[PDB]
RNA sequence: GGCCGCAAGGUUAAAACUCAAAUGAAUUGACGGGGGCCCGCACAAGCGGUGGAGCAUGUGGUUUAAUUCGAUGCAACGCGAAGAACCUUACCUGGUCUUGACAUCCACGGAAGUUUUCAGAGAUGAGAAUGUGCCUUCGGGAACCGUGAGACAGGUGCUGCAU
RNA sequence: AGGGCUACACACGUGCUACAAUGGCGCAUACAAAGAGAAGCGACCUCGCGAGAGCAAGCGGACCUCAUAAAGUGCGUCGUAGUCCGGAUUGGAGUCUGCAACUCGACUCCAUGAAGUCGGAAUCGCUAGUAAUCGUGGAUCAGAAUGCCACGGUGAAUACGU
RNA sequence: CUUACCACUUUGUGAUUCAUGACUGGGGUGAAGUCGUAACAAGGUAACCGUAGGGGAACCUGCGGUUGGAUC
RNA sequence: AUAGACUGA
RNA sequence: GGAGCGGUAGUUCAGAGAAUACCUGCCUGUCACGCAGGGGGUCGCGGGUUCGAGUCCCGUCCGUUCCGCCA
C-alpha cells in the first residue's frame, strides 16, 4: 500500500473540549501539509464537538 | 443462614474489595432566583447615533516566496504605529561578508583626508590622481584609516509562568 | 538590489460621507479662540481655469507669515425627482515632494456618475455651555489623516422616581 | 470344629464443606464520553424519615411525623 | 409563568 | 411465481413545499436555549407520448405488503 491514498482519522481524548481543540488543530495542519504536497483533500465526516472543536474527523488524502 | 408474616417485608447479622480520610462545633471571606439601607447616565424621561449603502482604518480567516512580531470579554480590534514608495523593516527571493555592520585590545603598515575613471542592479571590486598634514621631550607621536591575530563582539532569538 | 507588510470567495470593530427643501448651487455681507515657523512660515506682484510656478519683503516673532473661519444673515434659483441629492468607480491631461509615486502618495482640471430614499434582531454616548452641529490649529512628517491631541462659534430636550 | 467380640471391606440415604459452572443480581475504581440537574442559598416545588404507587435516571406523587428550614 | 451546564496540571 | 402500494431538500412527510436539519448575524463570561436573516432537491434509473412530464405511459433496480392450496 505504498503508494496507495492512505485515510486519516483523528479522534480525540483525554482534555475533553480542549482535546477536541488539539483535534481540530490536528487536522487544520494536515490538510495544510497535503495541500503543500500537493494531494487532494476530502472531508469524508466530521462530528463537530459540543462546545469547540470536533470530536472525530475522518479525511481522504 | 435462622425465626416471624397471607404478602409487602421485619428481626439477628457478615466477608471479600476499596480510600486515607469520613465527621462534629466554631471562625474569616465569597456567594444566594435571602432580608434591610444606599450610590453611579445603571435603569426610568429625553436627544443623537451604530447594525442597512459607499469609502477609510484595524482584526480574524483565506491566499502567498513573504503577506514581520505583539495586543484577544468588559480591560484586543483608528491598539504598540505621534504617520510601510526607498529607509523605517525586524519578512521573502537573490547576490555577497565572516574577531565581523557595531566595541575594547596586541603587533605591523599607513597621516587623515580630497577628487577621477572603472565592472557590477547594488553590496563590492579594480584602479588613477591629489595632497601626506598637526602637538611635537622634534623625541614622540596624537588622531584617523587598513592588515594579521584572538580574547570577544552580535541576536527585534525563546520563556512576561524566573524578573 | 528587488518584492511584501497595501495580497482578497468572506466575518467583525471603530470612523468619514450620504440618502436632501431645518437643503444643493450662484452672488453679497458679519462675528472666534488656540498654535507653529529658520535645511522653516512665506507676504506683495506676475503667470496658469485650477493644483501651483517665477520673482521677492517681513519674521527666531503681542511686530511678519501661516490665515478669506464656517455654521449665520440678505437676494436668486432648484420644487419632491435617484433629482441642479449623493460622489463611489473609471478614462484622459497635469502639479508637488522625493534618487525614484508601477506594485504603493497627496492634490488639481475635463469627462462618467454606483449604491444609498433613514436601515431586522440587536446595540452605544450624553444631565449644561453638556448633547447635536460648524469650522481652526498641533505632534509624527522631504511627501503621505475621515485617526490622535487641543481650540473656539451656535446651542437644546429631559430626569415623576429607585 | 463351633459360638461371642471385633479390624479391613461393602450397600442405601442424609448432613456439612471446598473447588468449579452457561447465565444472571447488585457493589467498588475511572485525569476524557452520552442524558439530564436531584442535594448544598428559600438550590429556584424547603429538606429529611417511615410507607405505597409510578417513572430512562437522578427522582415524582399520596398519608403521617421532624426541624437537622430561610423570609415574615 | 419560563429559565439548564462550566472536563482534565 | 401472481395481485397492489410506493421511491421528491441531509432525514421524515406534501405536491417542487412543510417539519427537523445546516449556514450567517445577534443575546451570553462561553455553550445550550432563544431572536433575526438565508440557502439547500429538479423528483430512484432509463426510455416513449406530449408544444409541454416530478406528474401521463412502458421497461428496470429498489423497498413494502397479501396469496402461492387440495390430494
Ligand atoms: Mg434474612
Ligand atoms: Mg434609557
Ligand atoms: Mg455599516
Ligand atoms: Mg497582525
Ligand atoms: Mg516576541
Ligand atoms: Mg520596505
Ligand atoms: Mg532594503
Ligand atoms: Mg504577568
Ligand atoms: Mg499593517
Ligand atoms: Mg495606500
Ligand atoms: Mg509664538
Ligand atoms: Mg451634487
Ligand atoms: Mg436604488
Ligand atoms: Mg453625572
Ligand atoms: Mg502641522
Ligand atoms: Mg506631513
Ligand atoms: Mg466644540
Ligand atoms: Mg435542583
Ligand atoms: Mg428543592
Ligand atoms: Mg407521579
Ligand atoms: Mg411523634
Ligand atoms: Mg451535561
Redo the contacts with the bound molecule.
Sequence with gaps: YDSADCYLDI????????????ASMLE?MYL?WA??RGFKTEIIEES?????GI?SVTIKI
Design positions: 479522534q480525540a481524548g483525554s482534555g475533553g473540549t480542549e482535546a477536541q481543540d488539539w487544520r495544510r495541500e503543500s463537530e464537538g459540543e462546545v469547540a470530536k
